[PDB]
Amino acid sequence: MSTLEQTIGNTPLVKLQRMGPDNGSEVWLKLEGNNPAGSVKDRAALSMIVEAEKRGEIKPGDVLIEATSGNTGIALAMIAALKGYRMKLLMPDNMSQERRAAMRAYGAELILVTKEQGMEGARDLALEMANRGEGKLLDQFNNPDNPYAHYTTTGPEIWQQTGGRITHFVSSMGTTGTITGVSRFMREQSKPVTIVGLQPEEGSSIPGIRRWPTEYLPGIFNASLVDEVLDIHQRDAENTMRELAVREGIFCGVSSGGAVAGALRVAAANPDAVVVAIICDRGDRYLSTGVFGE
């Protein structure tokens, strides 16, 4: 609103009108697709770069590097274009060509590793580049500035937007930055707020959500910040995503369908609850995957 940076965050909070249970509960959707590049990752991407600037680490013209398997690449390509950085993105070679085009449109340089090398191989290559002087690694799974975005913006906004009436917060977990930052903020309030994390069922594939083995949970994650973990079946996430568009006019991705599937279970269980769920992204980049077909 001065510039594009000021359009990150302060996203709408809107109520489901047709899909909730009829038990007095309310389900409110935090529309992170309203961020300029269309997903929640704009918050972490902005924060990682702004805080690095504040620490004197980077200046416009410098090279930034990240390993990405999804929306973080798009968000970082956008912030780099916005703020005047050169962005290098390492990704496994099952990233869709459409998503590669989305990142390239902002001027980012993309680098492949094989699917079998994976995200681990992508991070290792990013470290090797950083050591050669080829750029600064952001490290979204380990960088505290990811959850800090949510501690300072997402959480406070949800509290204000609900007038402190929120009883439950529901987040599909990927990096865990969202749930971790929001929980940290909510824990500071006098009122108890139940923090609900979502993961896929074993064998379910839901873009953007991870079923972390206990031993390989991200560096930024703190199990004690989460009160309950619910599992989401892939088909339930996809069906709920399709239903959101047709019944509510809310056009979002698969993990957002998962978030609402989970929030509906929380709301059904707890009469008169005020449940807030993160809608992680708009549906646009999912159409070419076929997932909006019945």
Ligand X SMILES: *Cc1c(COP(=O)(O)O)cnc(C)c1O
- Contacts with its own copies, residue ranges (CB under 8 A): 1-4, 6-7, 12-15, 17-18, 31, 34, 36-38, 78-79, 81-84, 98, 101-102, 104-107, 161, 242, 245-251, 282-285, 287-288, 292
Measured CA to CA in angstroms, residue 150 lies from 118, 154, 177 at distances of 27, 5, 7
Task: Tell me how far, at minimum, the Cβ of 162 lies from its own copies, in Å.
Answer: 12
The residue among 58 and 119 lying less far from its own copies, judged by its C-beta, is 58
Which residue, judged by CB position, is nearest to ligand X in the bound state?
A: 208
The catalytic position among 25, 30, 39, 41 is 41
Which residue in 208, 257, 262, 283 binds ligand X (CB under 6 A)?
Answer: 208
Q: Would you call 255 a catalytic residue per the annotation?
A: yes
172 is a site residue for ligand X (CB under 6 A): yes
Whether 170 and 262 have beta carbons less than 8 Å apart is answered as yes
Measured CA to CA in angstroms, residue 213 lies from 196, 216, 218 at distances of 18, 5, 10
Q: Would you call 41 a catalytic residue per the annotation?
A: yes
Retrieve residue 153's tokens.
Answer: 């913006």
In the region spanning residues 2 to 41, those forming contacts with ligand X, defined by CB under 6 A, are 39-41
Residue whose structure tokens are 């865990």: 176
> Residue 293 in 3-state DSSP?
coil
The residue among 9 and 70 lying less far from ligand X, judged by its C-beta, is 70
Tell me the backbone φ, ψ of residue 139, rounded to 5 degrees. 65, 60
Among 179, 128, 121, which residue's Cα sits nearest to residue 151? 179
The residue among 147 and 238 lying less far from its own copies, judged by its C-beta, is 238
Residues designated as active site = 41, 255
